[PDB]
Amino acid sequence: QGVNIYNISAGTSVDLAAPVTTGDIVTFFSSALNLNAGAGNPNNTTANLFAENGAYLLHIAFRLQENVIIFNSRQPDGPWLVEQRVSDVANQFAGIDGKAMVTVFDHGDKYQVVINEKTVIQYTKQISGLTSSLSYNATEETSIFSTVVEAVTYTGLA
Amino acid sequence: MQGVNIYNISAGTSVDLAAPVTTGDIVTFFSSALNLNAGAGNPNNTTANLFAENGAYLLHIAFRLQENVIIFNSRQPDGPWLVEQRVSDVANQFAGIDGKAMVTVFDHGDKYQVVINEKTVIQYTKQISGLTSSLSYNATEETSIFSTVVEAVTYTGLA
């Protein structure tokens, strides 16, 4: 088992030293939570897990104006697949202020997404494979998270 | 089912877990500070602990700046400390990251794997087994190597 820490600046991606596969965990830690940021474009913040070929295994997008969290997948060159949505962004982060956590458990057939202690969705995968990269995309002007998000992975668990 | 539990532990206090930590689970203590020049411990500057339901120290992690060592031990509820394990050079274990730190403990059933940031500092073979039902972060606000409040995050139901 191993722990790897990644400091992801908004709008950048990072290659994992240890891949995230079935049974592994990744948590994105934000040192802030601004639910008063302007409207997204259309997204305020997104956190992604990528396969080796660049496919979006899991795309999580936070939209304040549409008051929704979107979950989807996409082939590197393909179009967004079947979009999953969950309403009320504020409610998902309820309980903890000034910071937040977004954890993704890779259960093989699904990705379990948890905001702080709340499981927001049991996402049935649309694309499978190990996660080799991660990204945090947003602007300094409208992101709901801190300018740098710390991603921590716990691997070798299985 | 797998779950995430968040606990804010103020220096010198303990918390009872909503979900116990057992084989295959993980606990990580997050500190928003790192003071390798804190006062003199007596002898501990900071300790992070995992307890069984009966009060036993499943794992006692003590950071000592002056003795420059991190100690690992266990003890039954009202018994003597058992066989101590040592890791010399505190600063070295936290090398690479400043201003903060994290201490992760993997419960591997037969051993506790302790990792400081990304570095595994010890494969601690348990002297006492059982589920972890409480955690503690002990220190004075003046001589702790960590922040006044440490955030413990547990990942459970993994197995």
Side-chain angles (χ1 to χ4, degrees), chain B residues 19-89:
Chain B
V21 160
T22 189
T23 301
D25 295 341
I26 315 311
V27 55
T28 292
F29 297 84
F30 296 91
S31 172
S32 58
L34 190 292
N35 182 15
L36 293 176
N37 290 305
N42 63 170
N44 309 143
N45 283 271
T46 295
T47 69
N49 312 287
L50 316 210
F51 304 85
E53 184 172 356
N54 58 34
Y57 271 88
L58 260 30
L59 180 61
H60 174 56
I61 306 164
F63 300 85
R64 298 175 185 178
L65 295 185
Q66 300 215 300
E67 277 185 35
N68 217 330
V69 69
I70 304 75
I71 279 167
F72 305 83
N73 213 334
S74 303
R75 88 193 303 219
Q76 294 297 348
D78 307 279
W81 290 105
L82 303 180
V83 188
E84 164 179 289
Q85 291 305 326
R86 296 196 166 215
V87 168
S88 300
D89 199 333

Side-chain angles (χ1 to χ4, degrees), chain B residues 3-5 20 40 47 56 65 76 87 97 139 143 151 158:
Chain B
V4 183
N5 283 270
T47 69
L65 295 185
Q76 294 297 348
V87 168
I97 300 300
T143 56
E151 187 179 84
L158 322 198

Side-chain angles (χ1 to χ4, degrees), chain A residues 5 12 21 32 35 40 49 61 66-67 74 76 84 88 96 99 101 109 122 127-128 138 148-149 154 156-158:
Chain A
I5 309 165
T12 68
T21 190
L35 300 187
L49 311 212
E66 290 171 40
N67 185 50
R74 173 169 85 77
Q84 288 298 314
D88 196 346
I96 299 166
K99 66 197 295 186
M101 287 173 64
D109 56 345
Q122 280 288 18
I127 305 164
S128 294
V148 174
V149 168
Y154 301 85
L157 308 194

Side-chain angles (χ1 to χ4, degrees), chain B residues 9-13 31-33 137 139-142 144 146-150:
Chain B
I9 315 82
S10 297
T13 65
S31 172
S32 58
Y137 157 46
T140 67
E141 74 294 303
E142 298 180 64
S144 183
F146 294 158
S147 45
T148 304
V149 175
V150 164

Side-chain angles (χ1 to χ4, degrees), chain A residues 1-5 7 25 27 29 96 99 101 103 105 107 112 114 116-117 119 122 150 152 154 157, chain B residues 1-6 8 26 28 30 100 102 104 106 108 113 115 117-118 120 151 153 155 158:
Chain A
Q1 291 61 41
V3 180
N4 284 275
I5 309 165
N7 295 158
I25 305 165
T27 294
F29 296 87
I96 299 166
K99 66 197 295 186
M101 287 173 64
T103 299
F105 292 87
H107 295 323
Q112 185 187 337
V114 186
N116 296 322
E117 307 186 326
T119 291
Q122 280 288 18
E150 183 183 76
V152 179
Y154 301 85
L157 308 194
Chain B
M1 173 58 86
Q2 295 222 38
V4 183
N5 283 270
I6 303 306
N8 292 114
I26 315 311
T28 292
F30 296 91
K100 61 184 181 183
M102 74 187 269
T104 298
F106 292 85
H108 294 320
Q113 185 190 334
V115 185
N117 293 324
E118 304 187 314
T120 296
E151 187 179 84
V153 175
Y155 297 88
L158 322 198

Side-chain angles (χ1 to χ4, degrees), chain A residues 68-138:
Chain A
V68 65
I69 306 315
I70 290 166
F71 303 86
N72 215 336
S73 297
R74 173 169 85 77
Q75 292 300 335
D77 312 303
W80 284 117
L81 302 172
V82 186
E83 182 183 281
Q84 288 298 314
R85 292 196 175 200
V86 174
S87 291
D88 196 346
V89 185
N91 191 210
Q92 314 303 160
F93 295 92
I96 299 166
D97 300 304
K99 66 197 295 186
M101 287 173 64
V102 184
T103 299
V104 178
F105 292 87
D106 181 347
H107 295 323
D109 56 345
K110 299 178 182 185
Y111 281 121
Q112 185 187 337
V113 182
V114 186
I115 287 67
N116 296 322
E117 307 186 326
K118 187 178 302 185
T119 291
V120 65
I121 191 165
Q122 280 288 18
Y123 185 87
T124 299
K125 295 186 180 181
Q126 297 194 77
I127 305 164
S128 294
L130 59 76
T131 293
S132 289
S133 294
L134 303 168
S135 82
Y136 158 45
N137 190 34

